[PDB]
A paper describes a structure:
However, a recent report has shown that the ZZ-domain of p62 also recognizes type-2 N-degrons, although with weaker affinity than with type-1 N-degrons. Therefore, we determined the structure of the ZZ-domain in complex with a variety of N-degrons comprising three type-1 N-degrons and five type-2 N-degrons. As described for the R-BiP complex, two aspartic acid residues, Asp129 and Asp149, bind to the α-amino group, and Asp147 forms a hydrogen bond with the first peptide bond, which means that these interactions are conserved in all different N-terminal residues. However, the side chain of the N-terminal residue of the N-degron is recognized differently. The side chain of Asn132 which undergoes a conformational change plays a critical role in interacting with the first residue of the N-degron. The bipolar nature of the side chain atoms (O and N) of Asn132 allow for the recognition of positively charged type-1 substrates as well as type-2 substrates, and especially N-terminal tyrosine and tryptophan residues since they possess polar atoms in the side chain. As expected, arginine at the primary position showed the strongest binding affinity with, intriguingly, tyrosine and tryptophan residues following in second and third place, respectively. Our structural and biochemical measurement data showed that the presence of tyrosine or tryptophan at the primary position resulted in relatively high affinity because these side chains contain polar atoms, oxygen in tyrosine and nitrogen in tryptophan that can form hydrogen bonds with the side chain of Asn132 of the ZZ-domain. Our structural information clearly explains the affinity measurement data as well as previous pull-down assay results showing that type-1 N-degrons and only a subset of type-2 N-degron peptides (Phe, Trp, and Tyr) displayed binding affinity with p62.
Intriguingly, the autophagy adapter p62/SQSTM1/Sequestosome-1 was recently reported to recognize N-degrons, the N-end rule substrates of the well-characterized UPS, and where ultimately these substrates are delivered to ALS8,9. p62 is a key selective autophagy adapter that plays a role in the degradation of various cellular constituents such as misfolded proteins and their aggregates, malfunctioning organelles, and invading pathogens. Intriguingly, it was recently reported that the central ZZ-domain in p62 plays a critical role in the recognition of N-terminal arginylated BiP/GRP78 by the Arg-tRNA transferase ATE1. Here, we present the high resolution structures of the ZZ-domain of p62 in complex with 8 different N-degrons including type-1 and type-2, and subsequently identify key determinants involved in the unusual recognition.
Author numbering: -3 to 45
Amino acid sequence: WEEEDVICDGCNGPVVGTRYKCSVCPDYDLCSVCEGKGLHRGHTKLAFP
Ligand SMILES: [Zn+2]
Ligand SMILES: [Zn+2]
């Protein structure tokens, strides 16, 4: 029962719904809100659920 949860690197809450993971940074993720706020805007991101 090893589980991987995804925490937003902005609000530090878990990412539920759309996940914006950085394509450059290893293991960097933002939630839909923090993405909307323009965080980490210098790196390309992958927007999957
Ligand atoms: Zn967030
Ligand atoms: Zn980045």
